[PDB]
Amino acid sequence: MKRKVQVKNITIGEGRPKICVPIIGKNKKDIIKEAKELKDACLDIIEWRVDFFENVENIKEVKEVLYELRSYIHDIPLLFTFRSVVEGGEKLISRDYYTTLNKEISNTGLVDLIDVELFMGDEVIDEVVNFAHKKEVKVIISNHDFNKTPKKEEIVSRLCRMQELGADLPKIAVMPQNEKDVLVLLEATNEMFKIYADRPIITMSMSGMGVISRLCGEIFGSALTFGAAKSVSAPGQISFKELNSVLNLLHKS
Amino acid sequence: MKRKVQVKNITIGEGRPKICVPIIGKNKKDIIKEAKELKDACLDIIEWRVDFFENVENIKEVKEVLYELRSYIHDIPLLFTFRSVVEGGEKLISRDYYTTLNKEISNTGLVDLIDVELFMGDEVIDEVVNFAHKKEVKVIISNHDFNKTPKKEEIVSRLCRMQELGADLPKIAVMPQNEKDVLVLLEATNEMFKIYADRPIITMSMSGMGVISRLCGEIFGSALTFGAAKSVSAPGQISFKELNSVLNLLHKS
Ligand SMILES: *[C@H]1C=C(C(=O)[O-])C[C@@H](O)[C@@H]1O
Numbered sequence: 001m002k003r004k005v006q007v008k009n010i011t012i013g014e015g016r017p018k019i020c021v022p023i024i025g026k027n028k029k030d031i032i033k034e035a036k037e038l039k040d041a042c043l044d045i046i047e048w049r050v051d052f053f054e055n056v057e058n059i060k061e062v063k064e065v066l067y068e069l070r071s072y073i074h075d076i077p078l079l080f081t082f083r084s085v086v087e088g089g090e091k092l093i094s095r096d097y098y099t100t101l102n103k104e105i106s107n108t109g110l111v112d113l114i115d116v117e118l119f120m121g122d123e124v125i126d127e128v129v130n131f132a133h134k135k136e137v138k139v140i141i142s143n144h145d146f147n148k149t150p151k152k153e154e155i156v157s158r159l160c161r162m163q164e165l166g167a168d169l170p171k172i173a174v175m176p177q178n179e180k181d182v183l184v185l186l187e188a189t190n191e192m193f194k195i196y197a198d199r200p201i202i203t204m205s206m207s208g209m210g211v212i213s214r215l216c217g218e219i220f221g222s223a224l225t226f227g228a229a230k231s232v233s234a235p236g237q238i239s240f241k242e243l244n245s246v247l248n249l250l251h252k253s
Numbered sequence: 254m255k256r257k258v259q260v261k262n263i264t265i266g267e268g269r270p271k272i273c274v275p276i277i278g279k280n281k282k283d284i285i286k287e288a289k290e291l292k293d294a295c296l297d298i299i300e301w302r303v304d305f306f307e308n309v310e311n312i313k314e315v316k317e318v319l320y321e322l323r324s325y326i327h328d329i330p331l332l333f334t335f336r337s338v339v340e341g342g343e344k345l346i347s348r349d350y351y352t353t354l355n356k357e358i359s360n361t362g363l364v365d366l367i368d369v370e371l372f373m374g375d376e377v378i379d380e381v382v383n384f385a386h387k388k389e390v391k392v393i394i395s396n397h398d399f400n401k402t403p404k405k406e407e408i409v410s411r412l413c414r415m416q417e418l419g420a421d422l423p424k425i426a427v428m429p430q431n432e433k434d435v436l437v438l439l440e441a442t443n444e445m446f447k448i449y450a451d452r453p454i455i456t457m458s459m460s461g462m463g464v465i466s467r468l469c470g471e472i473f474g475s476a477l478t479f480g481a482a483k484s485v486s487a488p489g490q491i492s493f494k495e496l497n498s499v500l501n502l503l504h505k506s
């Protein structure tokens with residue numbers, strides 16, 4: 001009754017939640033060094049957090065890294081994400097360029113998924129999505145709130161809008177100010193998963209307090225969880241290796 | 254700040270939730286066989302589910318087991334529990350023997366904690382609680398519902414009755430019939446913890462669906478969690494060695 005998102009040998013939205021490991025190097029040497037350490041590691045998808053790449057405004061240099069990166073990762077699903085400043089990024093860039101970066105990178109045929117930020121707008125979203133599906137690229141439409149956890153109804157409403165915008169995978173990250181906020185996130189996730197969701201969704205409650213939301217996706221509905229290699233790409237992620245053992249332990253419980 | 258329950262080298266209600274493992278053997282040899290396996294294991298407390306013991310109706314023989322058991326787990330905290338048929342037990346006994354068993358054993362000075370069922374009535378509870386504290390034995394006043402998860406308010410109400418009846422550790426285990434019921438348990442748990450708790454509490458949502466409640470007590474408020482050795486004594490138990498790593502992992506988070 002729900003659609004699944006297949007990327008290579010990985011089926012998002014079925015079985016145990018899929019582990020995604022970010023690459024956050026500031027330069028080609030470190031990025032390649034990062035990719036080499038993950039080739040034979042136990043994980044499902046790799047996310048290139050390009051917002052960390054120092055020459056990110058130079059599209060040719062971004063492609064150069066992308067080529068070399070695919071050579072080492074060959075058939076591991078690869079998500080491309082430029083996380084903007086409003087949603088936790090550190091590099092500021094034009095909105096016209098955010099579109100160009102995502103389109104040009106989508107056009108290479110080298111990325112399997114691309115992340116597009118909801119707030120960025122219908123104009124930006126529709127163009128990135130239409131062009132990503134041209135090349136069979138799956139799209140994550142994402143939304144992050146680093147200060148608050150909206151009410152469950154509001155969270156559900158955002159995941160629904162993302163779905164209307166053609167997102168192959170709606171994604172929402174929220175920040176708890178208390179323990180109950182964490183449960184509100186889980187509550188909205190399962191209501192979405194059971195009643196309104198039409199495909200897989202990705203959700204998380206950030207920081208140490210909401211870490212449970214990164215582990216219990218199999219019961220509650222989040223199809224993908226992010227684990228860190230050396231350093232964190234978002235507050236609350238634990239090492240991908242420990243995430244793998246916890247997900248496996250819960251798969252047989 | 255509030256009360257903590259000290260049993261030997263273990264401080265319940267501080268840092269990591271504590272791990273309790275039950276011994277469920279039917280005869281002396283098996284019980285001791287289990288004790289030797291948990292002797293130097295990474296657990297905090299050992300629970301003797303004496304209801305599994307075939308010769309439970311002869312106090313003499315029950316005591317003969319304690320004496321030998323101690324020789325192995327002399328320094329490890331020992332909880333003595335006779336789980337009645339009504340709340341998941343496997344052996345029927347008169348309410349009067351239930352009292353004498355708990356009083357006689359508690360009188361030996363060999364047990365560190367004992368579990369009395371809330372629904373067993375104030376008569377039985379006052380009698381057992383009073384005597385227990387006189388021997389300096391901690392009391393867990395418990396309640397289990399294998400059918401459903403009562404509304405949040407009821408769970409907190411039960412946990413509160415337990416405190417007023419003098420429990421050193423209130424305990425409730427409930428059965429989820431849906432994912433939301435798991436969040437209700439956690440929500441009720443956190444409410445007790447921040448608003449009404451004067452002592453550490455123990456809570457869990459049973460079955461695979463509720464397993465997440467055995468892993469996140471540090472955040473939501475449960476001070477003790479039960480893990481299985483070779484097999485489970487309640488639906489949804491994880492092996493104790495695995496449980497230990499997840500709790501240590503989440504403690505530093
Ligand atoms: C989306 C969400 C993340 C998280 O909360 O862990 C990590 C980021 O790197 C992703 O873009």
Ligand SMILES: *[C@H]1C=C(C(=O)[O-])C[C@@H](O)[C@@H]1O
Pocket residue numbers: 275300302334336368426457459479486487488490
């Ligand atoms: C009380 C709770 C249990 C649980 O749900 O794990 C098992 C019993 O052994 C305890 O007495």
